[PDB]
Structures are given as structure tokens and as C-alpha cells.
Design an enzyme around this catalytic site. Structure first.
Site, PDB file in Angstrom:
ATOM      1  N   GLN A  18     -20.683   8.454  11.799  1.00 31.17           N
ATOM      2  CA  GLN A  18     -21.124   8.586  10.395  1.00 31.17           C
ATOM      3  C   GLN A  18     -20.168   9.540   9.683  1.00 31.17           C
ATOM      4  O   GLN A  18     -19.775   9.299   8.536  1.00 31.17           O
ATOM      5  CB  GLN A  18     -22.553   9.134  10.293  1.00 31.17           C
ATOM      6  CG  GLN A  18     -23.430   8.343   9.334  1.00 31.17           C
ATOM      7  CD  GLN A  18     -24.823   8.920   9.219  1.00 31.17           C
ATOM      8  OE1 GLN A  18     -25.377   9.440  10.192  1.00 31.17           O
ATOM      9  NE2 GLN A  18     -25.406   8.827   8.025  1.00 31.17           N
ATOM     10  N   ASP A  26     -11.214  -6.975   5.861  1.00 34.41           N
ATOM     11  CA  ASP A  26      -9.936  -7.574   6.228  1.00 34.41           C
ATOM     12  C   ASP A  26      -9.775  -7.554   7.754  1.00 34.41           C
ATOM     13  O   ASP A  26      -9.423  -8.564   8.357  1.00 34.41           O
ATOM     14  CB  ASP A  26      -8.766  -6.862   5.537  1.00 34.41           C
ATOM     15  CG  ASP A  26      -8.867  -6.916   4.035  1.00 34.41           C
ATOM     16  OD1 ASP A  26      -9.421  -7.905   3.534  1.00 34.41           O
ATOM     17  OD2 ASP A  26      -8.410  -5.962   3.354  1.00 34.41           O
ATOM     18  N   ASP A  81       0.852  -1.220   0.000  1.00 32.18           N
ATOM     19  CA  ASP A  81       0.000   0.000   0.000  1.00 32.18           C
ATOM     20  C   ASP A  81       0.889   1.272   0.000  1.00 32.18           C
ATOM     21  O   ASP A  81       1.549   1.587   0.987  1.00 32.18           O
ATOM     22  CB  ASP A  81      -0.930   0.036   1.219  1.00 32.18           C
ATOM     23  CG  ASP A  81      -2.169  -0.851   1.061  1.00 32.18           C
ATOM     24  OD1 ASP A  81      -2.469  -1.303  -0.070  1.00 32.18           O
ATOM     25  OD2 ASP A  81      -2.869  -1.072   2.076  1.00 32.18           O
TER      26      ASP A  81
END
Length: 330
Positions: free
Chosen positions: A286, A297, A15
Site C-alpha cells: 500500500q 499497459d 516519456d
């Protein structure tokens, strides 16, 4: 209490993550919040993202994230819990990926191929939104020769829980069937994550070969539904899909089949021969949900660490909800 030894196999990716401008996304033709494979249109993106002063390099790919979260939950047993298998290349990214993972406590029994550079995903962060651009690279080239190398054979011999992402089925189903045999030998436990709906749509033959050996099947709602489509189960009820997956998909094991379907905004479904239960989830609200992409994951990683230390199935799910929440809210 010492966890059982866990073998994880997936497609490893570095990543390469940075906060980037809106202009960055437009330059590479990227629809904010989506995830795609690298194409001609995105040529240059890795070179550019590496010039961002905030760039970070983190070992990734779905199964490596599971492995990292599972290891994180058992700090006491670095080097002595999770073994990860996949294919990288011997380059800077592969170097970072392997060493970072090792530093975190994972035994990295990875192959170094010459057929491609290490897999990577450009994680383009814009606020609480992530746009992903992935190139599988070396991960696609995991070889039979590595799978039969003494390190991998010993790691299989010495593990008792085996976890494979559905993505492994896109590379070579025989690498997966090898581990299914080993799980049989060591009287261990074999688990798959369904990973993504396209697995069931395009790699059903491969999935078909593995299912009989699979003790635990994990998936989200859309993967469960595509699983239904693949089995010609015409229903939208995820609970029904779980019952059938327990009792109507071939099973040749002795531990018992377990099915865990997560349902985002709705309760997780847990099924076995003794029936179906649901496991409540938080209403993730939220202006807090920063990493909607890695939730599954993180869930699997929590699940797996609780299963390894002997927790029963509801608390395996609950451990998973907890690790998914923490990782979403950074």
C-alpha cells in the site's frame, strides 16, 4: 516455444521523466497525481524538465509500453516477436524513442512525419506520485501512405496477433480497419484495449466500425462502464457488461469473442460464449504502489506475451496480473 508474431499499433510518445520539486508542479500549475494535455499554462515544461540532473528518456505511450513489457517477457526472441507501428518525427526524442525500443528487441516500423515533433509526456515524479503532461505531437499524423508502405504491409502479412489501443481510433479509424482486414487474411487474432472512457463517449462511431472484427476486447472498470453507457446498457454490473459484450455486440470472426474487464481492487472478469469467470487479484497494499499510471499497459503486455505462446485465457490474465504488479512496485 517460439511466440506467435505480434503487431502492435498505438500513439508513440517519449516519456521524459524526472524527480522534481513541489515548486516545479506549482510553476506549471499542475495538480499532483493528475494527467493532462499540454496547454498554454504548461509552456516551458519540457525545456525545464530537461535541466533536472536525474531526467530519463524512455519510449512510451500506452501501446509501446505493452510492446515493451511483452518483449521483456520473451528475451530469447529480440527482433523476432513484436512489430510496433506509429508515427514519430525525425528529431532527438524520436531518435531516442526508436533506438531505445530497437535495443529492447522491438521492430519499430514507425513513420517519420514532418507535420509535428515527436509525441512526449513529461512524467513529473514526486515520491510515489506521478503528474503527467502530454503532447501527442507526431502521433496524430500517422498517414495512409505509411500504412500502405511495404514495411507495414509485410509486417501485417507476417504477424498473427494484432493489438490496437483505443487511442488509435482518435487518429484515423481507416488505419485500424486495414489491420482488421489483414487479420482476416492471415487468419490471425484482433484485440483492442478500450484505453480510456472518453474513447466510448467521443469516438463511439469509430469504435463501432472496428468492434465486429474484434476477437478480444480488454478494458478496466470505468472503460467497461462507459462502454455500457455507449451501448445503452443500463447496469453497473461489470460481469453483465462482459456477457453482453460477448453475445450482443456484433461479431463476424471465427476464433470466438473474449472479453477481459479488469476491476482494480476487485477480481478481473473473463467472459466468452461458454460463460463468465473471475480471476482473483492481490490487494495491492500500500506504501508500495509507485506507478499506478502504467498498470493497465503492463497488464496488457503480460496478457499478450502469454497469449502469443499459447497459454489459455485464465493464465493470460494471471500473467497480466503478475507483470502489472512488478511494474507498479518498480
Amino acid at each position: 516455444s517460439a511466440p506467435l508474431r505480434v503487431y502492435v499499433q498505438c500513439n508513440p510518445l517519449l516519456d521524459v521523466s524526472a524527480h522534481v520539486s513541489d515548486e516545479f508542479l506549482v510553476k506549471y500549475g499542475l495538480e499532483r497525481g493528475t494527467a493532462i494535455l499540454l496547454s498554454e499554462r504548461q509552456k516551458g515544461i519540457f525545456d525545464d524538465i530537461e535541466k533536472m540532473p536525474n531526467v530519463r528518456y524512455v519510449p512510451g505511450g500506452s501501446g509501446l509500453n505493452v510492446a515493451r513489457v511483452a518483449q521483456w517477457m520473451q528475451q530469447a526472441y529480440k527482433g523476432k516477436f513484436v512489430t510496433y507501428v506509429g508515427c514519430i518525427a525525425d528529431d532527438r526524442y524520436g531518435k531516442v524513442l526508436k533506438e531505445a525500443a530497437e535495443h529492447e528487441g522491438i521492430v519499430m516500423a514507425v513513420e517519420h512525419t514532418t507535420k509535428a515533433g515527436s509525441g512526449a509526456c513529461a512524467v513529473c515524479i514526486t515520491g510515489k506520485e506521478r503528474t503527467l503532461v502530454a503532447d501527442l505531437g507526431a502521433a496524430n499524423h500517422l498517414s495512409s501512405e505509411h500504412m500502405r508502405s511495404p514495411a507495414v504491409v509485410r509486417a501485417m502479412d507476417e504477424s498473427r496477433i494484432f493489438y490496437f489501443s483505443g487511442f488509435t481510433l482518435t487518429v484515423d479509424v481507416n488505419h485500424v480497419l486495414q489491420a482488421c482486414r489483414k487479420a482476416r487474411e492471415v487468419d490471425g487474432l484482433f484485440m483492442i484495449n478500450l484505453s480510456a472512457p472518453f474513447i466510448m463517449q467521443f469516438f463511439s462511431a469509430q469504435l463501432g466500425e472496428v468492434l465486429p472484427y474484434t476477437d478480444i476486447i480488454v478494458a478496466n472498470r470505468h472503460e467497461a462502464k462507459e462502454f455500457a453507457n455507449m451501448m445503452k446498457w443500463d447496469t453497473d454490473c461489470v460481469e453483465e457488461i462482459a456477457r453482453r459484450a460477448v453475445s450482443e455486440v456484433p461479431y463476424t470472426g471465427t476464433k470466438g469473442r473474449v472479453v477481459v474487464f479488469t476491476r482494480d481492487i476487485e477480481s478481473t472478469v473473463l467472459a466468452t460464449k461458454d460463460g463468465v469467470e473471475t480471476v482473483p487479484v492481490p490487494q495491492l497494499d500500500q506504501d508500495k504502489v509507485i506507478d499506478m499510471n502504467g498498470a493497465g499497459d503492463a497488464f496488457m503486455g503480460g496478457f499478450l506475451s502469454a497469449y502469443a505462446v499459447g497459454k489459455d485465457l485464465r493464465r493470460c490474465c494471471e500473467t497480466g496480473h503478475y507483470t502489472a504488479q512488478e511494474v507498479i512496485q518498480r
